[PDB]
Design a protein around this motif. Sequence first.
Motif, PDB file in Angstrom:
ATOM      1  N   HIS A  87       0.814  -1.195   0.000  1.00 40.63           N
ATOM      2  CA  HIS A  87       0.000   0.000   0.000  1.00 40.63           C
ATOM      3  C   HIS A  87       0.848   1.246   0.000  1.00 40.63           C
ATOM      4  CE1 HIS A  87      -2.925   2.981   0.754  1.00 40.63           C
ATOM      5  NE2 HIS A  87      -3.898   2.132   1.037  1.00 40.63           N
ATOM      6  N   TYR A 112     -12.324   6.406  -5.061  1.00 41.58           N
ATOM      7  CA  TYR A 112     -12.071   6.724  -3.669  1.00 41.58           C
ATOM      8  C   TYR A 112     -12.979   7.856  -3.226  1.00 41.58           C
ATOM      9  CZ  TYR A 112      -9.255   8.048   0.471  1.00 41.58           C
ATOM     10  OH  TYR A 112      -8.802   8.342   1.733  1.00 41.58           O
ATOM     11  N   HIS A 117      -9.457   0.969   1.672  1.00 40.88           N
ATOM     12  CA  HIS A 117      -9.231   2.029   2.649  1.00 40.88           C
ATOM     13  C   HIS A 117     -10.307   1.936   3.740  1.00 40.88           C
ATOM     14  CE1 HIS A 117      -8.549   6.156   4.174  1.00 40.88           C
ATOM     15  NE2 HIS A 117      -9.849   6.098   4.390  1.00 40.88           N
ATOM     16  N   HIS A 142      -5.387  -0.217   6.479  1.00 45.43           N
ATOM     17  CA  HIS A 142      -5.337   0.669   7.635  1.00 45.43           C
ATOM     18  C   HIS A 142      -5.728  -0.002   8.943  1.00 45.43           C
ATOM     19  CE1 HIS A 142      -4.507   3.195   4.423  1.00 45.43           C
ATOM     20  NE2 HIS A 142      -5.718   3.672   4.193  1.00 45.43           N
ATOM     21  N   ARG A 145       0.296   1.849   7.440  1.00 40.25           N
ATOM     22  CA  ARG A 145       0.609   3.267   7.590  1.00 40.25           C
ATOM     23  C   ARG A 145       1.774   3.491   8.542  1.00 40.25           C
ATOM     24  NH1 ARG A 145      -5.487   5.924   7.560  1.00 40.25           N
ATOM     25  NH2 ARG A 145      -5.404   6.817   5.428  1.00 40.25           N
ATOM     26  N   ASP A 168       1.890   3.677   3.247  1.00 37.33           N
ATOM     27  CA  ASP A 168       0.892   4.546   2.644  1.00 37.33           C
ATOM     28  C   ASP A 168       1.564   5.877   2.341  1.00 37.33           C
ATOM     29  OD1 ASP A 168      -1.414   5.497   1.687  1.00 37.33           O
ATOM     30  OD2 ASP A 168      -2.548   5.589   3.554  1.00 37.33           O
TER      31      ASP A 168
HETATM   32 ZN   LIG Z   1      -6.117   5.193   2.554  1.00 32.38          ZN
END
Ligand SMILES: [Zn+2]
Length: 324
Positions: A21, A97, A177, A206, A230, A263
């Motif tokens: 990611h 998104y 996401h 995430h 992340r 990310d």
């Molecule tokens: Zn995201």
Amino acid sequence: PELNTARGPIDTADLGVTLMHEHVFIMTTEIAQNYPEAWGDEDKRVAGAIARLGELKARGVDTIVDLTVIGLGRYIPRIARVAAATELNIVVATGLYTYNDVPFYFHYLGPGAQLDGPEIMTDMFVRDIEHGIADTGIKAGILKCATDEPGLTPGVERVLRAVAQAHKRTGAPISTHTHAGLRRGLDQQRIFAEEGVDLSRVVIGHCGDSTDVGYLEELIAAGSYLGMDRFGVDVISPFQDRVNIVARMCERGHADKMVLSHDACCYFDALPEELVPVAMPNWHYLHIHNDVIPALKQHGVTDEQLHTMLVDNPRRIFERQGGY
Ligand SMILES: [Zn+2]
Ligand SMILES: [Zn+2]
């Protein structure tokens, strides 16, 4: 067994160490075109992206998955230039998104639109995966959608179903996401299941932000992989918390269900450039290799477990092909 890439098909055995990611450039396309000064020099941006990704490759990552899609400023001809000048594999994505509504473009036609009839969003995703993106010849390797604070708005829900159907047509994996604190993974799993989606073909993104073992294990139980993705985003979750959740999950035998990332990106328009390097200094592509991996070994995460998350899992994910 092969998978498509910004430089064409690669053997899936050549994926190697894969960050599941990442991003290269994120922007609101129409703002950037209209107020171009922040982006500034196109060649410098592109050359800078190539430098950052080449460095990443020299440090021992073999592949990134760029989850920039519609809504995040996807522009593949610029990614084609980047990919052409690094040996890093770049897997590219399709999807949409949104946290709430869909673009005006979808406002008139499709399920729940002003008028409607056939969904046309799914077809666009399938065209990207199967034919190629725009004029580009580059096919998307993965599907991306989002669910955040607002939860399942009608817009978010329409996209989840569009993405689910694109996945059932093509077999391409879904990467997601979420808002982890609101545990939006469970919401997406529900919609997907209603669509008949094999949840083991889905990465819930995430989860790396979460410290709730019960929630992660509940997502795994339904079958999905988890994006511990992340690393470096310390304002959302400190280094120690991110490292511990992954360590704990490994000790519970879930390494075979986890993938890692930052990310991170080379450009993100919605935030002042000069401020982010000082507020989140560890938010770059090399944080996992410089800091996270050693800290993981310190918690007794084995070399085999790391290999599973970085190499074995992404390869398994990408070897599952064909629709149903
Ligand atoms: Zn995201
Ligand atoms: Zn992202």
